[PDB]
Amino acid sequence: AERPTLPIPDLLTTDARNRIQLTIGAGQSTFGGKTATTWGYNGNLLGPAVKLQRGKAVTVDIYNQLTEETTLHWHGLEVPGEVDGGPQGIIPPGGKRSVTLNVDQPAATCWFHPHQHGKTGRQVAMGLAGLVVIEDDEILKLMLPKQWGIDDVPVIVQDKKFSADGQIDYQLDVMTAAVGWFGDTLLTNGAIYPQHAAPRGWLRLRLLNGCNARSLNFATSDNRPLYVIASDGGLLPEPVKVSELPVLMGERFEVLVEVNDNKPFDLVTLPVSQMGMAIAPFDKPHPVMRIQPIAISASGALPDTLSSLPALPSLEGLTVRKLQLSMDPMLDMMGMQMLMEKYGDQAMAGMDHHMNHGGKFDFHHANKINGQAFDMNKPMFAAAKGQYERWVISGVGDMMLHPFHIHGTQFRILSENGKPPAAHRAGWKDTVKVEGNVSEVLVKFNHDAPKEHAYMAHCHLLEHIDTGMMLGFTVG
């Protein structure tokens, strides 16, 4: 049997009333020939790509047809707290909420997903994620590959595991609270190892790591390079050639890759040094999708220059905020123990050389920032509006991977886990690696967020969010 074609999310623009309609609902999908209940936006699984233009306002009407509450957060969008769709942005089951997004940031690939309090991991695992394609005047002048689903394609990479009956096997338990929910089956826009037919020339891939907990590292099967043109928050100043591209949970990169006649190749993910993530089949390079060259010329360009990246400002005088991540030691130890007991030594491959005691010992509030498991009723601080701040985020105290994400902003990384950032990570980012060390970012918030619709700052390993590793903050 041939590989299925790569599914392409619909690219959705506004109607005459200036509205985009998103319906959140349950349906069925098929994986390895077996039906599973899944959730999607405007469909059974995943979601569309919402197209936004800088300087234009759109209204999004969001219909929750689930039987449980949800929220809809626009990861990477610089919007006021009131429309941010964090855990306070509740959409009742069977209800509708509308938001007006006044887009004011550069071209970028962002995404959207639920932020339901304590249930974000489950709701993403069940299928809910969509994309956001922001354009501006600058990017169109570059003449990059631009034919959606032909030479400009989104690639949403996610793992799942399934029970014997075919259903998605999600659990938030002591093991997954520590190390995350991860699986043995890799999906690419919902499909298992699809093919994508691409014209000769440049192919633009908009890569999203949509896994709950699994870090990825993209490369090609024949070692042809990837030319990174954009990070979370938009274009780099010029392309950065890489042989491999690590991507943390919730991160996006756009790359160009060459397509040549008669030479199919795979996009793959290489084994990562993260606990639990190198269990077979992920102990070896794992195909993500096959690129099948078509002998028709593609028109897109890889320009020498992409955008202007402003200089980092002087750091003296700027407010320095400390955010100390932590995990309860006992529940960290217990989750790791359960991982080791289940999978053995392979659960640490590639790393460096039972009674009820009450609510005090509950893993549901075991993970914390500044000594506090997330309290939706108490923002931890008020950040300045329109002012650069230096946020220092420490994971010293444990060795888990914490891709740290801050709502309401695109920031510049100053130190990523104790080193200056790689060139392709030195531009606009909404995520920074924290793993047993300290990161520092330069952040600015252009929009207000009140106590009642506060911004969040959190680890993007979803099971850590749901077990407390998040804080709220206000702006303005």
For ligand [O-], the binding residues (CB under 6 A) are 73, 75, 405
Q: How far is the CB of 471 from ligand [O-] (least distance, A)?
A: 13
CA distance 282 to 275: 12
Q: Does position 464 bind Cu ion by CB under 5 A?
A: yes
Q: Does position 459 bind Cu ion by CB under 5 A?
A: yes
Which of ligand [O-], Cu ion, none interacts with 461 (beta carbon under 5 to 8 A by kind)? Cu ion
Tell me how far the alpha carbon of residue 402 is from its chain's centroid.
12
Residue closest to 255 by CA, chosen among 285, 235, 233, 269: 235
Six-digit token pair at 83? Answer: 């429309």
Which of Cu ion, ligand [O-], none interacts with 298 (beta carbon under 5 to 8 A by kind)? none
> Does 464 count as an annotated binding residue?
yes
Residue nearest Cu ion, CB atom distance:
459
Q: By CB under 5 A, what part of segment 35-94 binds Cu ion?
A: 75
> Does 196 count as an annotated binding residue?
no
Q: Which is nearer to ligand [O-], 239 or 250 (CB)?
A: 250
> Does 113 count as an annotated binding residue?
yes
Tell me how far the alpha carbon of residue 89 is from its chain's centroid.
19
Q: How far is the CB of 177 from Cu ion (least distance, A)?
A: 10
CA distance 296 to 316: 55
Q: How far is the CB of 75 from ligand [O-] (least distance, A)?
A: 5
Q: Please check whether residue 144 is in contact with residue 254, taking contact to mean a CB–CB distance below 8 angstroms.
A: no
> Does 459 count as an annotated binding residue?
yes
Characterize 136-157 residue by residue with b for buried, 16 or more Cβ atoms within 10 angstroms of its Cβ, and e for exposed: beebeebebbeebbbbbbbbbb
Q: How far is the CB of 430 from ligand [O-] (least distance, A)?
A: 9
Q: How far is the CB of 299 from Cu ion (least distance, A)?
A: 33
> Does 75 count as an annotated binding residue?
yes
Q: Which is nearer to ligand [O-], 207 or 257 (CB)?
A: 207
> Does 286 count as an annotated binding residue?
no
Q: Which is nearer to ligand [O-], 80 or 293 (CB)?
A: 80
Size, binding site for Cu ion by CB under 5 A:
8
> Does 407 count as an annotated binding residue?
yes
> Does 354 count as an annotated binding residue?
no
Which of Cu ion, ligand [O-], none interacts with 51 (beta carbon under 5 to 8 A by kind)? none
Q: How far is the CB of 400 from Cu ion (least distance, A)?
A: 6
Which of ligand [O-], Cu ion, none interacts with 459 (beta carbon under 5 to 8 A by kind)? Cu ion
> Does 115 count as an annotated binding residue?
yes
Of 24, 461, 462, 475, the one binding Cu ion by CB under 5 A: 461
Q: How far is the CB of 458 from ligand [O-] (least distance, A)?
A: 7
Q: Which segments are annotated as binding site for Cu cation?
A: 73, 75, 113, 115, 402, 405, 407, 458-460, 464
Binding site for Cu ion (CB under 5 A): 75, 250, 402, 407, 456, 459, 461, 464
